[PDB]
């Protein structure tokens, strides 16, 4: 169904371009290190496009992961 709860709905005003704000971004990453699809982020054509670039940045400054491991299976 994917009708859990979008991350935009349960969050506040926040800058898409501040690639240092890890406390937030993490909200946009999966149980693994992957980037949540728009169905999950709640974002727009333009927003997601940006949030995309931003994460790839914080990744580089060793802030956000590139891939995690899984806890179940």
């Amino acid at each position: 169904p994917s009708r859990k709860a979008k991350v935009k709905a349960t969050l506040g005003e926040f800058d898409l371009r501040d690639y240092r704000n890890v406390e937030v971004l993490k909200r946009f990453l999966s149980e693994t290190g992957k980037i949540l699809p728009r169905r999950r982020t709640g974002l727009s054509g333009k927003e997601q496009r940006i949030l995309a670039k931003t994460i790839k940045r914080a990744r580089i400054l060793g802030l956000l992961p590139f891939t995690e491991k899984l806890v179940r299976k």
Binding site: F66, K69, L70, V71, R72, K73
Partner: protein
């Protein structure tokens, strides 16, 4: 006897044979069991039963080292990945947590004919 309680259990599954290696907290393997080591030699190793056995005889060799606790690490998709885990969950070992860290490239080596 070497008395090494609590360790790691890597489970390396394939589409041609499933194996298991039991390593110590640090990462050094104590005793390792495959499928072709049990008795089976070909199309047989891919079987979930093959994996079952591979898992169980792999713990029996650890109980010899007094292994009690274990963290499970799965590598890949094989045929009976599950049955291997469910195996250890009944072998007599305390299963901490199952980890999935199967190796996915981020697009590197051009894979061969069969993708």
């Amino acid at each position: 006897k070497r008395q090494v309680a609590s360790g790691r259990a890597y489970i390396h599954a394939s589409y041609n044979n499933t194996i298991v290696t039991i390593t110590d907290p640090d990462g050094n393997p104590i005793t390792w069991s495959s499928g072709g080591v049990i008795g089976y030699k070909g199309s047989r190793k891919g079987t979930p039963y093959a994996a079952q056995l591979a898992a169980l005889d792999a713990a029996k060799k650890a109980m010899a080292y007094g292994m009690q606790s274990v963290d499970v690490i799965v590598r890949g998709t094989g045929a009976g990945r599950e049955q291997a885990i469910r195996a250890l969950q009944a072998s007599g070992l305390q299963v901490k947590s199952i980890v999935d860290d199967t190796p996915v490239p981020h697009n590197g080596c051009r894979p061969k004919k069969k993708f």
